């Protein structure tokens, strides 16, 4: 078995290997990359996502989210308070202000320590989940707005045509902005490209061990667990590396820098934080190996999770028994 310890693998494709996205995902899996839940892909030196980032300041962040925490430093939830719209230029200035800027630090490890010690005492503002793309239309390789769609994959594997579309999202971050522990909707893959700015630290649990994280989470968030049989779908719970280590949960960590791709694999729980002002683009995707995970994916039916138009059809075709109850949640 390849990569039996489930370590995060880092790939350096050549320009010739970068032409065929599907084939390269399959190659990474042949080397065991999926066992970690997360892989890093450093593009060839010939490649570029676009020519410059000099003209992005007028993009609107219609609903910036202030991420307010409750709990203790290592075990907390966050809720998203909606703020007034602002441009990317206004958001960058805010991120760089004395109130929100990254503190002085020695290295990524010192910054990580400061994040876990102090995150709960601040409420950074995240420009998340903004439909759009920063890839130039002439970038032919690994262009996240030009991937094969998940609806087409389902049709190719299973023979059934379904409604729905699949488009990317932009994320503008600042110091301490946080992504809570989650897997993707319907346990899909994701791919994330860090266009510019400061790094993003990721934590991940191997897919084969995901239920261990779920059992810990039920213990640590006991009211939430009673409310919903899949409450990590709400994307609000944080658990620190120290707490995971104390409870024997297998995980790994890695820092993504500007110019790098990260891929999350089906049922790979992940969480993390931004080091300072940055912009990332991400989208979900599928492969033939995903279909069996999609059929088995948990779902939030308490109603909190409220998820894209296109998820309907995946539940309807892959999970017909659940269908009914799940759509009662979403209406």
Cite the annotated binding site for Fe cation by residue number: 182, 184, 270
Closer by beta carbon to Ni ion, 183 or else 319? 183
Counting contacts by CB under 5 A, is residue 54 touching Mg ion? no
Binding site residue list: 126, 182, 184, 192, 200, 228, 234-235, 270, 300, 302
141 binds, among ligand OGA, Ni ion, Mg ion, none (CB under 5 to 8 A by kind): none
Contact pick of 67, 166, 192, 298 for ligand OGA (by CB under 6 A): 192
CA distance 329 to 331: 6
Counting contacts by CB under 5 A, is residue 228 touching Zn ion? yes
CA distance 265 to 25: 10
Contact 127, 62 (CB under 8 A): no
Counting contacts by CB under 6 A, is residue 273 touching ligand OGA? no
Reading the block at residue 107, the tokens are 């290295």
Stretch that binds Zn ion, among 21-29, 99-107, 192-200, 221-229 (CB under 5 A): 221-229
For residues 200 to 219, the per-residue mask of contacts with Zn ion, x marking binding by CB under 5 A and - elsewhere, is --------------------
Q: What is the dihedral of CA 82, 85, 88, 92, to 10 degrees?
A: -60
CB of 190 to ligand OGA, least distance (A): 3
CB of 293 to Mg ion, least distance (A): 38
CA distance 314 to 166: 12
Distances in Å between the Cα of 114 and the Cα atoms of 80, 102, 239, 245, 290 are: 22, 10, 15, 18, 37
Counting contacts by CB under 6 A, is residue 256 touching ligand OGA? no
CA distance 36 to 167: 26
Place of tokens 């346990």: 187
CA distance 182 to 38: 13
Mapped onto helix, strand or coil, the DSSP state of residue 147 is coil
CA distance 162 to 282: 23
For residues 144 to 173, the per-residue mask of contacts with ligand OGA, x marking binding by CB under 6 A and - elsewhere, is ---------------------------x--
Contact 294, 227 (CB under 8 A): no
First-to-last alpha carbon distance for the chain, in angstroms, is 44
For residues 214 to 253, the per-residue mask of contacts with ligand OGA, x marking binding by CB under 6 A and - elsewhere, is ----------------------------------------
According to CB under 5 A, which residues from 55 to 84 bind Mg ion? 56, 58-59
Residues that bind ligand OGA (CB under 6 A): 171, 179, 190, 192, 264, 270, 280, 282
Residues that bind Mg ion (CB under 5 A): 56, 58-59
Residues that bind Zn ion (CB under 5 A): 228, 300, 302, 304
């Amino acid at each position: 078995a390849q990569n039996p310890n489930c370590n995060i693998m880092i790939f350096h494709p050549t320009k010739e290997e970068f032409n065929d996205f599907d084939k390269y995902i399959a190659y990474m899996e042949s080397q065991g990359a999926h066992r970690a839940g997360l892989a890093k892909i450093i593009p060839p030196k010939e490649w570029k996502a676009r020519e410059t980032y000099d003209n992005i300041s007028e993009i609107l962040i219609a609903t910036p989210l202030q991420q307010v925490a409750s709990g203790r430093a290592g075990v907390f939830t966050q809720y998203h308070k909606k703020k007034k719209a602002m441009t990317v230029g206004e958001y960058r200035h805010l991120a760089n202000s004395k109130k929100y800027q990254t503190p002085p630090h020695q290295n990524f490890e010192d910054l990580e320590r400061k994040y876990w010690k102090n995150r709960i005492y601040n409420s950074p503002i995240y420009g998340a989940d903004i439909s759009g793309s920063l890839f130039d239309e002439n970038t032919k390789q690994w262009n996240l707005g030009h991937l094969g769609t998940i609806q087409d994959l389902l049709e190719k594997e299973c023979g059934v045509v379904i409604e729905g579309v699949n488009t990317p999202y932009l994320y503008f971050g600042m110091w301490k902005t946080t992504f809570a522990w989650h897997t993707e909707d319907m346990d899909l893959y994701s791919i994330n490209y860090l266009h510019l700015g400061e790094p993003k630290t990721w934590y991940v649990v191997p897919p084969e061990h995901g239920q261990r994280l779920e059992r810990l989470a039920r213990e640590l968030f006991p009211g939430s667990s009673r409310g919903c049989g899949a409450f990590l779908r709400h994307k609000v719970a944080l658990i620190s590396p120290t707490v995971l280590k104390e409870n024997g949960i297998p995980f790994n960590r890695i820092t993504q820098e500007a110019g790098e791709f990260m891929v999350t694999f089906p049922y790979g729980y992940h969480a993390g934080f931004n080091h300072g002002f940055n912009c990332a683009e991400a989208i979900n995707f599928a492969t033939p190996r995903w279909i069996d995970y999609g059929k088995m994916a948990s779902q939030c039916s308490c109603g909190e999770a409220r998820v894209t138009f296109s998820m309907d059809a995946f539940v309807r075709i892959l999970q017909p028994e659940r269908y009914d109850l799940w759509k009662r949640g979403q209406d």
